[PDB]
């Protein structure tokens, strides 16, 4: 639905 | 980039540094991709001719055994150890393992696992006793740069990575040509089946494979497609390389500032139905202190 994510970032979970 | 280290850089000879590396001669190649299904946000295009100076590049991603030797020699503490957690794919977390409630937006298959790091890749209770020659994972971009510098090396630029991964083919889809499984043979370790629910393991592996698995490409590099994402030196952007200039076409280093560093090659989790990012032109990024069970690196060197 949005661009597929292959790189999970530490910032993303805040 | 100006890193900081708490270990001295050891002296190494050219012959020592070059072991396990292939010499890529200076020349030009066609970088980028124009697949109509590419995600615009990824900036796979334009296709462009890039000239590179000669360089060396590792045939194999850095292995657990190699990273352990680095840690033994330096005492290096990885970002995942400092933070106390790293990302593990949900199917690889043993039931009962303590997990954080953290949510990667849009990617609920990632689990933040306290105590997951390079030597315990699924969290406390896991080990690498049976994976000495697998790519090291849970290594951040910082960790990769530290290893590479200790080793007398550096990370490849994205252009260097892609020239080497393309293995002497002009604008092929994959390192070996245009078919994913020519002659019905698996050529890389990616996902088969229904992502993220069931990996059939048809290619032999539902996690990382040894760094020497599958045939190499035409330059002798192994697992440039699939297995683990590989950190490159460049800051990420989707459009810096759309400019036509010496800076973007001769030994390009990427933009001077950014927030995430480039990763190339895809991993054991990639699948056509979701990311289709194991094509050699594909690209994504991650922030430099991040780490995950599907990301590692290979080194390059100036001869
Ligand atoms: C959303 O756009 C989406 C979701 C999953 C896989 C692909 C795409 N494009
Ligand atoms: Ca696989
Ligand atoms: Ca790879
Ligand atoms: Cl092994
Ligand atoms: Cu992917």
* Bridge partners, B230 (sequence order): B264, B296
Rg (CA), chain B: 18
Residues of A in contact with B112 (CB under 8 A): 13
Q: What is the domain extent for residue B22?
A: 1-303
Pairing assessment for the beta strands B55-58 and B21-24 based on DSSP bridges: antiparallel
Query: What is the spatial distance between Cα A3 and Cα B79, in angstroms, rounded to a whole number?
Result: 27
B229-235 and B300-301 beta bridge pairing: unpaired
SS3 state of residue B198: strand
What spacing in Å lies between the alpha carbon of A3 and ligand 5's midpoint? 11
How far apart are the C-alpha atoms of B116 and B127, rounded to whole Å?
10
- Rounded distance between C-alpha atoms, residue B130 and residue B137, angstroms: 14
Q: Which of B102, B112, B275 sits opposite A6 (nearest CB)?
A: B275
Mutate to test the pocket of ligand 1, among A1, A3, A5 (most ligand atoms within 8 A of CB): A1
Residue owning tokens 């330096």: B74
Ramachandran angles phi, psi of B262, nearest 5°: -70, 140
Return phi, psi of residue B163, to 5°. Answer: -60, -45
Whose CA is closest to B80, among B300, B286, B224? B286
Q: How far apart are CA B39 and CA B33, in angstroms?
A: 11
Taking the C-alpha atoms of B164, B166, B170 and B173 in order, what is their torsion angle to the nearest 10 degrees?
-160
- Six token digits for residue B288: 């430099």
B7 Cβ closer than 6 Å to some ligand 1 atom: no
Neighbours of B297 (CB within 10 A): 30
Question: CA-CA distance, B118 to B121, in Å (whole number)?
Answer: 5
- Count: domains in chain B: 1
Pairwise CB contact (< 8 Å): B110 & A6: no
Short-list B219, B162, B213, B177, CA closest to B23: B219
Contact check, Cβ <8 Å, B277/A7: no
Rounded Cα gap, residues B251 and A9, in angstroms:
28
Ligand nearest to the CA of B63: 4
- Does residue B37 belong to the interface with chain A, where contact is any CB pair within 8 Å? no
Which residues, numbered 1 to 14 in chain A, qualify as contacts with chain B under a Cβ-Cβ cut-off of 8 Å? 1-13
Strands across the sheet containing B261-264: B284-286, B261-264, B229-235, B295-296
At residue B194, what are phi and psi to the nearest 5 degrees?
Answer: -120, 100
The tokens for B300 are 């390059």
- B162 by Cβ neighbours in 10 Å (0-12 / 13-18 / 19+) ranks as buried
User: CA-CA distances (angstroms) from residue B9 to B4, B6, B12, B68, B152?
Assistant: 12, 10, 9, 17, 8
Instruction: Tell me the C-alpha distance between B21 and B123, whole Å.
Output: 32
**Cβ distance of B286 and A7 shorter than 8 Å:** yes
Any ligand 1 atom below 6 A from CB of A4? yes
The alpha carbon of residue B158 and the mean position of all alpha carbons in its chain are separated, in whole angstroms, by: 11
Q: How far is CA B3 from CA B68, B142, B203, in A?
A: 21, 8, 38
Resolution (A): 1.2
CA dihedral B208, B214, B220, B225 (to 10 degrees): -50
B229 touches chain A (CB under 8 A): yes
Closest to B223 in 3D by CA, of B183, B190, B263, B191: B190
How remote is the CA of residue B39 from the centroid of ligand 1, in Å?
A: 10
Q: Quote the CA–CA distance of B66 and B236 in Å, as a whole number.
A: 27
* Helix, strand or coil, per DSSP, at residue B65: helix
């Amino acid at each position: 639905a949005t661009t597929p994510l292959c790189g999970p970032s530490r910032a993303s979970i805040l | 980039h100006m890193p900081s280290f708490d270990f001295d850089i050891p002296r190494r000879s050219p012959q020592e540094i070059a072991k396990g590396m292939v010499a890529i001669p200076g020349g030009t190649f066609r970088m980028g991709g124009e697949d109509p299904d590419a995600f615009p946000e990824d900036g796979e295009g334009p296709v462009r001719t890039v000239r590179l100076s000669p360089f060396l590049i590792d045939r194999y991603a850095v292995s657990n055994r190699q990273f352990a030797a680095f840690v033994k020699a330096t005492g290096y503490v990885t970002d995942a150890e400092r933070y106390g957690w790293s990302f593990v794919f949900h199917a690889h977390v043993a039931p009962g393992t303590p997990v954080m409630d953290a949510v990667v937006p849009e990617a609920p298959w990632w689990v933040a696992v306290p105590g997951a790091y390079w030597k315990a890749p699924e969290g406390p209770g896991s080990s690498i006793t049976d994976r000495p020659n697998h790519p090291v994972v849970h290594v951040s971009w910082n960790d990769a740069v530290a290893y590479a510098t200790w080793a007398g090396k550096r990370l490849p630029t994205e252009a260097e990575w892609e020239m080497a991964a393309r293995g002497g083919l002009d604008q092929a889809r994959y390192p070996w040509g245009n078919e994913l499984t020519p002659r019905g043979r698996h050529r890389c370790n990616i996902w088969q089946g229904t992502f993220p629910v069931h990996d059939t393991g048809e290619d032999g592996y539902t996690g990382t494979a040894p760094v020497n698995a599958f045939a190499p490409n035409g330059y002798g590099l192994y697992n440039v497609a699939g297995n683990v994402w590989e950190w490159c030196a460049d800051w990420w952007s989707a459009d810096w390389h759309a400019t036509e200039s010496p800076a973007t076409r001769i030994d390009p280093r990427g933009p001077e500032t950014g927030t995430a560093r480039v990763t190339k090659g895809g991993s054991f989790l990639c699948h056509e139905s979701y990311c289709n990012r194991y094509r050699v032109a594909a690209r994504t990024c991650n922030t430099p202190d991040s780490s995950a069970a599907h990301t590692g690196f290979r080194c390059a060197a100036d001869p």
